[PDB]
């Protein structure tokens, strides 16, 4: 028994959290940790070293922003502890980690050590009454209400497709590549350098993310538009300068459909969907093609869904109704799905109790991983 389950949606770029039963996540902020770079000289300065959340975003110039999680895998656990601890601070939740069971979203095909050490972190430093690690696609489909269909997500560090059949997420059809939002921003940074504009500071990579979020689009024809000179719209920096982008705005999110530009034998998003559908039972292909759900912030580019339809039509068999849905809460899909899932009475039997974790250990988590 506890108060209420807290759905903490992780993400390599933006963490999202709130209590279960909530409508929208009330607490969302970037998943980075910024510590100052300069020298504390004057007294009365910004006290404290590590900053997370709105304060780290505000005084962005001083920090040396780093990410503790990359490609859905935690690289530094200390920064993650401070991030989770920040989630439970007075600025976000104002609660205690002893009276709340925790729903935790997590990307597929990740190492066992993520669930194991993350569970140790929660049940030991936080001592939560109940932890429950789950997928992300299952939650997104629960958020849309329907039940069978694939889920195409592309967050900040991962991207995958999961063919879900009535909740049983088919584990033998989850294609997963590691080319997501942050990497698109990284490649955009490279193209900005090729344009002439240099951005290499860690607290400037964020400006590159801002440019990706408000100045890029997806060309329908990938090559016909490359053979033309666009209008070259400008961009206003926080500094007040001006950057004319040019061709570095459509080729930047082109990476998601062709990771040859980054030099990698992986596949595009369209191939992840088509391979995820084709590596399933032939009796469900039409049902999966009639139900595609997008989620994740990288599915917010202009002309994304339209280009995805064109690509899938080029790869799907002829005269099969393809249908891509795209709800208005792609950033909040996994969190809303967590709010629906954890607010049910079956969640009591679906979690892992603290007592159980102390009895068996990590094997209990891998046992009851679904």
């Amino acid at each position: 028994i506890a108060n209420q389950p807290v759905v903490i949606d992780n993400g390599s770029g933006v963490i999202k959290a709130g209590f279960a039963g909530d409508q929208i996540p009330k607490y969302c902020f970037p998943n980075y940790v910024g510590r100052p770079k300069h020298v504390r000289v004057m007294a009365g300065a910004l006290e404290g070293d590590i900053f997370i959340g709105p304060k780290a975003e505000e005084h962005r110039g001083l920090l040396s922003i780093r990410y503790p999680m990359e490609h859905g895998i935690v690289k530094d656990w200390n920064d993650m502890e401070r991030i989770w601890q920040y989630v439970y601070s007075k600025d976000q939740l104002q609660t205690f980690s002893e009276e709340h069971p925790v729903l935790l979203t997590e990307a597929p095909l990740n190492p066992r050590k993520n669930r194991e050490r993350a569970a140790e972190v929660f049940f030991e430093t936080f001592n939560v009454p109940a932890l429950f690690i789950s997928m992300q696609a299952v939650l997104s489909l629960y958020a849309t209400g329907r039940t069978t269909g694939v889920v195409l997500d592309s967050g900040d560090g991962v991207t995958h497709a999961v063919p879900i059949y009535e909740g049983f997420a088919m584990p033998h059809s989850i294609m997963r590549i590691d080319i997501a939002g942050r990497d698109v921003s990284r490649f955009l940074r490279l193209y900005l350098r090729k344009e002439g504009y240099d951005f290499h500071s860690s607290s400037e990579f964020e400006i590159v993310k801002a440019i990706k979020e408000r100045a890029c689009y997806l060309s329908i024809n990938p090559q016909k538009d490359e053979t033309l000179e666009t209008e070259k719209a400008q961009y206003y920096l926080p500094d007040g300068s001006t950057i004319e982008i040019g061709p570095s705005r459509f080729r930047a999110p082109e990476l998601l459909f062709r990771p040859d530009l980054i030099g990698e034998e992986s596949e595009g998003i369209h191939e992840v969907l088509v391979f995820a559908i084709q590596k399933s039972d032939m009796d469900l292909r039409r049902t999966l093609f009639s139900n595609i759900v997008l989620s994740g912030g990288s599915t917010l580019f202009k002309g994304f869904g339209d280009r995805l339809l064109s690509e899938v039509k080029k790869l799907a068999p002829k005269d099969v109704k393809i249908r891509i849905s795209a709800p208005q809460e792609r950033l909040y899909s996994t969190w809303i799905g967590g709010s629906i899932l954890a607010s049910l009475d079956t969640f009591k039997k679906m979690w892992v109790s603290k007592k159980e974790y102390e009895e068996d250990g990590a094997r209990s988590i891998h046992r009851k991983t679904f």
Binding site: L300, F304, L309, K313, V320, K321, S325, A326, P327
Partner: protein, 37 residues
């Protein structure tokens, strides 16, 4: 403030504008489907 303090020392400039300033001035759709028969 300390006006007589400024009367004491000689460098404090009075009747000069103390602050110089520049003038001032006053998501996508859903169900992108495509049937095929």
């Amino acid at each position: 403030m300390a006006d007589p303090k400024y009367a004491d020392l000689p460098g404090i400039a009075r009747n000069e504008p103390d602050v110089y300033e520049t003038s001032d001035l006053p998501l996508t759709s859903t169900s992108v489907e495509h049937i095929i028969v």
